[PDB]
Amino acid sequence: VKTNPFVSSQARKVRKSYFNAKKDAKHVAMSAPLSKELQEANGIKRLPIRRDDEVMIFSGRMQNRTGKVTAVKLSEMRIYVDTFTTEKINGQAVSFPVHPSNVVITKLKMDKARKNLIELRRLGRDQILAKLGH
Amino acid sequence: AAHKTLRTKRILCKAMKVNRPMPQFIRQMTGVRHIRNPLTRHWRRRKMNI
Amino acid sequence: GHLKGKELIKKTRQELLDELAGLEKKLFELKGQKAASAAATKLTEIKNTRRDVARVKSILMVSQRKALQEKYAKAKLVPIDLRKHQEKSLRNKLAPKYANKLTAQESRRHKCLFERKFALKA
Amino acid sequence: GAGTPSFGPRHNKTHTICRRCGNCFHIQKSKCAKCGYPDATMRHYDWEKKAHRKRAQGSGEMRHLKVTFAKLQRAYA
RNA sequence: AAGUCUCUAAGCAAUGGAUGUCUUGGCUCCUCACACGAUGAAGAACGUGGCAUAAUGUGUUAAGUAACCGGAGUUGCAAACAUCAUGACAGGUUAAUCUUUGAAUGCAAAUUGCGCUAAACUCGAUCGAGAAGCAUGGGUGUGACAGUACUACA
RNA sequence: UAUUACAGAUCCUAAUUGAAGUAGCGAUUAUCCAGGCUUGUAUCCUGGGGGCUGAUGAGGAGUAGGGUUUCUGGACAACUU
RNA sequence: UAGUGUGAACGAAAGAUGAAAAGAACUCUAAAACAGAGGGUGAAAAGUUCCUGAACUUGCUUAGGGUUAAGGCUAUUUAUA
RNA sequence: UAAGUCAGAUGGAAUGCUGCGCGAUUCAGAGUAAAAGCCUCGUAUGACCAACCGCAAGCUUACGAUGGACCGGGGAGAGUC
RNA sequence: GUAGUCUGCCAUACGCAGGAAGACCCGCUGAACUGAAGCAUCUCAUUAAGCGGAGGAAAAGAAACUAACUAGGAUUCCCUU
């Protein structure tokens, strides 16, 4: 149960804030877990997704393919990918949007800000697990 | 008309360049449908009263 | 091509004014040819050079103002441009020294009758 | 008599566009019925509290005034 | 004593938008704030985006520019630019720029009417133009004028 | 616990019947024939008959008012009984 | 806001395709962006003010009644009292 | 800033169904192709390191300020009550 | 004649006033419907509309005050009277 009064627990208010958030919060809302090869390497589960890296979806028509992110979309709230294409009735491939929380990140590409984010969360996760005592 | 003033002529200009169909690309962008241009009219039917 | 606001600060005032007029000329020639040729790529070039001519006007004006404020700063009755913005209410409200200043009766008793600290024993 | 035939000679204009209101400025009497120009004070009455809030602040742009609301959010939050 | 007519029922449809389910909208109660304006407000008009009429940004620096703070494409098509930074843009402030108006204030106005100016400013080649000035009322100071008002010395 | 049960209020709002393929399609000189363009014209254009308006003219032009109705090109879902 | 009035003023209607546009290629009849018919997309046409799709009214098909305006109730061997 | 995109069947899609694990100072809530403590944002809760760190007014050791008593004094709002 | 003052008017230097908003607040002005089962005093009401003017609150406020006691001690508000 929440103690902080200034955050609201009504469903109307949360959806309105969520869909009409600022740009910086929407990038954080668009995020996914790493594959276990990258979890041991970088020392984090969860990261926000960019146009550099590639991703791998379990369960679907497009089941179990890797492919790079062509475009993130924050208003439409979904991710376009290479490979993930059905053709039209016309002979024309069209990329098909998928929400990142269904998806695992298989490779990652560094940025000064991405390295600076990772070194924070590594040091944060070392403190919290020592506190809880696992 | 003729013998219109200039600030009368300014209003009659703005009243005719505003009179047009809505562009096609807004329906493609926003995906909304069934938006009409409000300041469309016909000269014979509705008078301006300006 | 287009140029940064950082590196224009180093340049001379008269160096910017010949840069300005030459940069503004290529705006005018493109506005002539958009009727004839029209089409893509030109319409991003006309956009960038409209943004760049603002860039030069902007940094000229802050180069003026920082220089020109130093002339009139630390002196009585400055110009209206160089005064800070504020509200109407806050200007006409007098400074809190004058409101709070003490009468010669009141200050002399405040020698003894000030709001002194005290406490009790346990 | 008083209907269709007597509508014929209706070509003069009683009211003209008003500078302050921009809307009903009386040419013969020279006053904006809606806003009261040129009286320096702007016309509103408490019996037309409905029609007043169509004209009054909020309806327009509020270019200077919206940024002075936005300061007072930051200072108290 | 005829019926493709008319009357009633059932099944599949046409018309119509009820019912049911949904909800980024209201309504109320409580909390905090009110620091608008001659430094040109509120309100009005017109501009301005690559395809933009309304609204929203914004004012020939016109979907913005500069600086600081965020920090990677905030949407259809088209085009350009940017990646461990010489830092993308629908992000958020502050400061510039700030069209015609409006208390509106050089004199007017159903008019884009009719003025005025020591220097400096800026183009223009001593002398024109633009730019920027010039309102009323009252306060303190400064100056000038008016008087068979009071008074001294002639 | 309540904005809690409808056939009526010349009730409110929204949609829809019969009457009914009925009443009716007026006012304005008068139309006819051959061609052109077309899937398609008495009607849109050309040519030729027959007519009307008959200088206070459905002629040529302006105030007030309207405000792009002007002009060229393309178009017929609707409108111009 | 649309819209009304010379004016002060007055003031509506209008939400929902699907998980995702995958928003219906190409062929046939046709003068044809008329209108369909094949064939496809999708889990399902839900096919563009498109979820569910009630009543009134209408169309088609099937079954009976009809000189008693029609309907109701009671009784049975269901067209009579 | 905790802990399963667990395994099996169904499905266009699993968060539901059956069975076994794990978190909690966090089972407020939302997003996600279907009902989610453990898929994502959060929530909870203390820890962490930058920014500041100043505006006026009064001080600061005694015939300086304030008060009590005693001695000797002045006056207290006019077209107003 | 000149040199002080008094009074008036004009010009100029520097900051100020106006306009917006007005629920609450302060000062004026001021209805009637209504109730009295009529109606005129009375009531609705020292209310609505109107005019003038402030602030984040305003206004009030330091006794020509209560009291009759075993005495209270500026103003404002809540409970009761």
Written overview of the protein:
Chain A: It comes from Trichomonas vaginalis (strain ATCC PRA-98 / G3). Chain A: This is Ribosomal protein L24, putative. Chain A: Keywords: Ribonucleoprotein, Ribosomal protein. Chain A: One of its GO terms (molecular function) is structural constituent of ribosome. Chain A: Pfam families: Ribosomal_L26. Chain C: One of its GO terms (cellular component) is cytosolic large ribosomal subunit. The structure is cut from a larger assembly and holds chains A (134 residues), B (50 residues), C (122 residues) and D (77 residues). Chain A is built from four helices and eight strands, in the order H-H-E-H-E-E-E-E-E-E-E-H. By secondary structure, chain A is α+β, with helices and mostly antiparallel strands. Chain A has a four-stranded antiparallel β-sheet with strand order 5-4-3-8, with no helix packed on it. In chain A, strands 1-2 form a two-stranded antiparallel ribbon. In chain A, strands 6-7 form a two-stranded antiparallel ribbon. By secondary structure, chain B is mainly α. Chain C has 122 residues and is mainly α. Chain C is 59% helix and 0% strand. In chain C, helix 1 runs antiparallel to helix 2. The longest helix of chain C has 31 residues. Chain D is mainly alpha-helical and 77 residues long. Chain D has a two-stranded antiparallel ribbon with strand order 1-2. The radius of gyration of chain D is 20 Å and the shape is elongated. The chains hardly touch. Chain A binds five RNA strands through helix 1, helix 2, strand 1, strand 4 and helix 4.
Put simply, the count of helices of chain B is 2
Main sheet: strand order of chain A: 5-4-3-8
**Largest sheet report of chain B:** none
Helix content of chain B: 25-40%
- Note the gap between the termini of chain B: 13 Å
Structural class of chain A: alpha+beta
Structural class of chain B: mainly alpha
Record the SSE blueprint.
This is part of a larger assembly, with chains A (about 130 residues), B (about 50 residues), C (about 120 residues) and D (about 80 residues).
Chain A: H1 11-19, H2 23-29, E1 31-33, H3 36-42, E2 46-48, E3 54-57, E4 66-73, E5 78-81, E6 85-87, E7 93-95, E8 103-107, H4 112-132
Antiparallel strand pairs in A: 1-2, 3-4, 3-8, 4-5, 6-7
Chain B: H1 6-17, H2 25-30
Chain C: H1 13-36, H2 42-72, H3 88-92, H4 96-100, H5 104-110
The structure holds 5 RNA strands.
Family (chain C): Belongs to the universal ribosomal protein uL29 family.
GO cellular component, one term (chain C): cytosolic large ribosomal subunit
Protein name (chain C): Ribosomal protein L29, putative
Q: Main attributes?
A:
part of a larger assembly; 4 chains; C: 122 residues; 5 helices; elongated; D: 77 residues; mainly alpha; two-stranded antiparallel sheet; 2 helices; RNA-binding
